[PDB]
Amino acid sequence: NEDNARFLLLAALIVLYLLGGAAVFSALELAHERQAKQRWEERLAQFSRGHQLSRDELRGFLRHYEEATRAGIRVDNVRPRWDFTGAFYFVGTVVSTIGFGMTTPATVGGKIFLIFYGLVGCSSTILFFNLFLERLITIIAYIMKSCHQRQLRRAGWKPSVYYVMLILCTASILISCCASAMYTPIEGWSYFDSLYFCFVAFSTIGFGDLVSSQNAHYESQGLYRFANFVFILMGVCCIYSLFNVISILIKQSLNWILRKMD
Amino acid sequence: NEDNARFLLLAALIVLYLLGGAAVFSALELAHERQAKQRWEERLAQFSRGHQLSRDELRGFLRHYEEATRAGIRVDNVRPRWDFTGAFYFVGTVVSTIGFGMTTPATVGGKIFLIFYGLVGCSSTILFFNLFLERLITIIAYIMKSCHQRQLRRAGWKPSVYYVMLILCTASILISCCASAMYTPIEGWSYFDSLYFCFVAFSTIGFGDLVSSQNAHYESQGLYRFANFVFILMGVCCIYSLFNVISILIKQSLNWILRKMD
Numbered sequence: 001n002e003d004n005a006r007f008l009l010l011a012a013l014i015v016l017y018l019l020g021g022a023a024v025f026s027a028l029e030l031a032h033e034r035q036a037k038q039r040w041e042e043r044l045a046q047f048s049r050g051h052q053l054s055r056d057e058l059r060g061f062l063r064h065y066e067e068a069t070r071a072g073i074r075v076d077n078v079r080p081r082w083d084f085t086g087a088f089y090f091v092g093t094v095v096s097t098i099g100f101g102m103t104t105p106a107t108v109g110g111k112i113f114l115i116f117y118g119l120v121g122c123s124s125t126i127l128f129f130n131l132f133l134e135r136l137i138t139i140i141a142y143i144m145k146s147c148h149q150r151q152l153r154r155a156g157w158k159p160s161v162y163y164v165m166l167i168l169c170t171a172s173i174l175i176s177c178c179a180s181a182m183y184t185p186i187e188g189w190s191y192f193d194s195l196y197f198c199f200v201a202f203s204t205i206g207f208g209d210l211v212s213s214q215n216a217h218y219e220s221q222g223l224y225r226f227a228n229f230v231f232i233l234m235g236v237c238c239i240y241s242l243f244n245v246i247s248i249l250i251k252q253s254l255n256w257i258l259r260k261m262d
Numbered sequence: 263n264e265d266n267a268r269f270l271l272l273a274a275l276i277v278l279y280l281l282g283g284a285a286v287f288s289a290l291e292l293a294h295e296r297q298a299k300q301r302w303e304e305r306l307a308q309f310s311r312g313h314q315l316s317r318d319e320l321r322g323f324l325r326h327y328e329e330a331t332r333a334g335i336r337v338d339n340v341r342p343r344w345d346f347t348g349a350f351y352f353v354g355t356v357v358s359t360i361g362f363g364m365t366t367p368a369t370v371g372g373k374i375f376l377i378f379y380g381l382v383g384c385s386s387t388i389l390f391f392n393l394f395l396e397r398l399i400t401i402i403a404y405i406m407k408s409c410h411q412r413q414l415r416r417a418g419w420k421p422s423v424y425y426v427m428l429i430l431c432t433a434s435i436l437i438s439c440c441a442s443a444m445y446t447p448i449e450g451w452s453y454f455d456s457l458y459f460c461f462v463a464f465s466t467i468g469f470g471d472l473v474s475s476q477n478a479h480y481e482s483q484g485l486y487r488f489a490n491f492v493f494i495l496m497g498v499c500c501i502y503s504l505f506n507v508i509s510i511l512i513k514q515s516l517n518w519i520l521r522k523m524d
């Protein structure tokens with residue numbers, strides 16, 4: 001009867017959290033959305049007025065452009081899709097459940113293989129993340145034991161959850177700052193935009209509004225892709241570990257509050 | 263020393279998997295990509311020649327349209343963003359790490375709150391999924407024990423991993439088929455497109471090329487959103503449980519492989 005109570009309490013808390021978040025976000029974003037819409041309307045009217053065009057023809061032109069931009073065409077020069085490197089970056093995004101959305105399958109037969117490939121790969125990636133977390137905890141315990149032994153001359157040493165959480169937070173902040181050190185001069189962006197992209201990518205959310213390393217020319221274009229791969233991998237591992245630790249702490253807190261409720 | 267060997271073997275297998283998948287996907291998609299690009303080029307040339315326009319002006323027009331479409335502006339009459347319900351949809355996609363990408367924050371201040379909200383919510387969602395899996399296993403065990411007891415008259419009854427995997431696969435297939443029964447008449451899609459969307463959404467990949475329930479008018483429009491919410495929640499739970507079970511099986515197989523090798 002305890003487990004059912006815990007499940008119900010968690011569900012209710014999540015629902016309240018969602019309602020509050022929606023209430024805040026609407027008030028934060030509505031006015032900017034409306035201003036952008038009116039700006040686009042005025043620009044469209046000016047363009048349709050200067051060149052004495054019609055209104056339906058521009059609609060057909062824009063529909064064709066939407067189809068083209070879905071295929072992969074963009075106004076600025078971009079790297080081609082579906083080449084060996086582009087396919088490598090697509091499968092890398094697929095197996096980690098990021099899914100930026102800049103490259104998607106378009107033919108029948110290219111979708112079934114996607115289903116089977118993802119089904120077999122996502123489980124392996126999850127197993128890899130779990131093994132990484134176990135190794136990190138073990139090495140932390142060994143380092144702490146060795147440090148204590150060395151300080152004395154002046155297994156059962158596993159650290160608690162709080163210290164693991166602090167270490168993970170510090171590592172994630174350092175990795176994000178180091179990654180945002182680049183991406184600023186290579187691609188024109190603000191530092192805060194780089195941090196926002198790093199958080200969106202590392203948490204495996206992947207909105208797709210900002211995607212890195214596609215400009216059809218990146219000077220060296222060599223070690224840059226390797227660095228991007230390394231940074232994304234490390235960030236994803238650290239963030240997933242942090243989420244698991246936070247979940248453990250939340251479960252302990254729920255246990256306490258339900259014991260208190262009597 | 264065994265754990266390090268397991269880690270290294272898993273990493274090597276994942277790398278080989280990625281290379282093979284990239285090769286296959288490129289070989290399947292390159293020609294279609296090239297044909298689409300050529301078609302768009304021909305259409306643009308025809309339009310430019312017909313209306314005696316220049317080439318840079320159309321580029322500026324398309325850049326303005328890209329900026330407008332980065333906001334909540336589409337071609338075929340979509341629902342407004344950030345009113346109250348768009349925010350609810352957005353936060354629902356955020357906390358489940360789907361990230362479709364149809365709605366993104368645009369103002370500074372709306373991004374920091376996103377960071378904190380996601381950091382606190384993703385852990386709770388993961389905990390909810392784990393608790394659901396535990397409850398499902400317990401109820402399966404109870405049902406099996408009760409059925410055996412009833413058949414006889416004509417705790418320690420934990421089912422094995424294989425039966426849990428089979429049950430999860432059957433439930434996921436049934437849920438996906440029932441969901442794809444809808445979305446076919448309400449929105450104009452093929453049945454296979456509905457299945458593809460269901461798999462992409464349930465696995466928390468979320469490419470964003472197909473997003474449901476946005477046309478600014480959906481007849482009843484009251485029960486449709488509730489049904490969409492229920493279906494997505496159930497599918498995500500089932501798929502995550504299946505991924506965890508398959509990961510356990512893969513770990514067992516790796517242990518056997520290491521044991522056999524000397």
Ligand SMILES: CCCCC/C=C\C/C=C\CCCCCCCC(=O)O
Pocket residue numbers: 085088089092093095096125128213225226228229232233273274276277
């Ligand atoms: C050697 C470690 C093996 C473990 C691999 C596991 C998971 C892969 C996860 C994430 C890879 C991120 C994809 C980015 C690819 C960019 C490549 C490019 O810019 O072209």
Ligand SMILES: CCCCC/C=C\C/C=C\CCCCCCCC(=O)O
Pocket residue numbers: 011012014015347350351354355357358387390475486487488490491494495
């Ligand atoms: C009562 C259940 C509590 C658990 C909730 C946990 C996680 C939420 C997960 C997924 C929600 C899917 C997106 C919702 C779509 C909005 C519907 C609409 O407006 O069209």
Ligand SMILES: CCCCCCCCCCCCCCCC
Pocket residue numbers: 085220221222225226
């Ligand atoms: C451990 C091996 C990982 C594989 C990393 C390969 C990524 C691709 C390398 C980048 C190749 C770009 C083409 C070179 C152009 C100079």
Ligand SMILES: CCCCCCCCCCCCCCCC
Pocket residue numbers: 015482483484487488491
């Ligand atoms: C347990 C309650 C969770 C469901 C919360 C409400 C679902 C989303 C709102 C339903 C759609 C209302 C639109 C009304 C327009 C006719």
Ligand SMILES: CCCCCCCCCCCC
Pocket residue numbers: 004007008011495496
């Ligand atoms: C005894 C019944 C109490 C538990 C019911 C929980 C309802 C949550 C349903 C949504 C989970 C998919």
Ligand SMILES: CCCCCCCCCCCC
Pocket residue numbers: 013014017250253256257382386
């Ligand atoms: C959905 C997330 C809600 C946050 C759960 C934490 C509960 C805080 C109580 C702490 C008491 C010690």
Ligand SMILES: CCCCCCCCCCCC
Pocket residue numbers: 017020021023024027
């Ligand atoms: C995410 C939890 C925060 C809850 C606070 C929401 C109440 C304020 C909403 C009204 C703003 C005008």
Ligand SMILES: CCCCCCCCCCCC
Pocket residue numbers: 219220223224226227230
């Ligand atoms: C002028 C562009 C130089 C690009 C430098 C990137 C090299 C990073 C390699 C480090 C890998 C972790």
Ligand SMILES: CCCCCCCCCCCC
Pocket residue numbers: 233234237266269270273
């Ligand atoms: C004995 C050395 C074990 C180190 C194994 C390397 C595994 C790849 C490192 C990248 C994972 C984040």
Ligand SMILES: CCCCCCCCCCCC
Pocket residue numbers: 120124275276279512515516518519
């Ligand atoms: C990385 C995905 C491939 C994992 C393959 C699993 C091992 C199969 C051999 C076990 C058969 C008994």
Ligand SMILES: CCCCCCCCCCCC
Pocket residue numbers: 279282283285286289
């Ligand atoms: C997922 C791994 C499947 C095996 C890949 C074989 C690669 C064949 C290349 C086909 C080129 C025509």
Ligand SMILES: CCCCCCCCCCCC
Pocket residue numbers: 481482485486489492
């Ligand atoms: C033409 C009217 C279509 C509306 C049907 C939606 C009913 C879904 C209810 C199912 C609840 C799980």
Ligand SMILES: CCCCCCCC
Pocket residue numbers: 016019020023
């Ligand atoms: C804390 C929950 C707030 C209730 C939602 C507000 C609806 C306008």
Ligand SMILES: CCCCCCCC
Pocket residue numbers: 024027028
């Ligand atoms: C955490 C509550 C912040 C709400 C302020 C809304 C800004 C207008």
Ligand SMILES: CCCCCCCC
Pocket residue numbers: 109110112113116
């Ligand atoms: C042309 C169809 C081939 C797709 C591969 C078959 C799925 C395993």
Ligand SMILES: CCCCCCCC
Pocket residue numbers: 178181182185
């Ligand atoms: C000019 C770019 C250099 C960025 C620093 C390298 C990453 C540590």
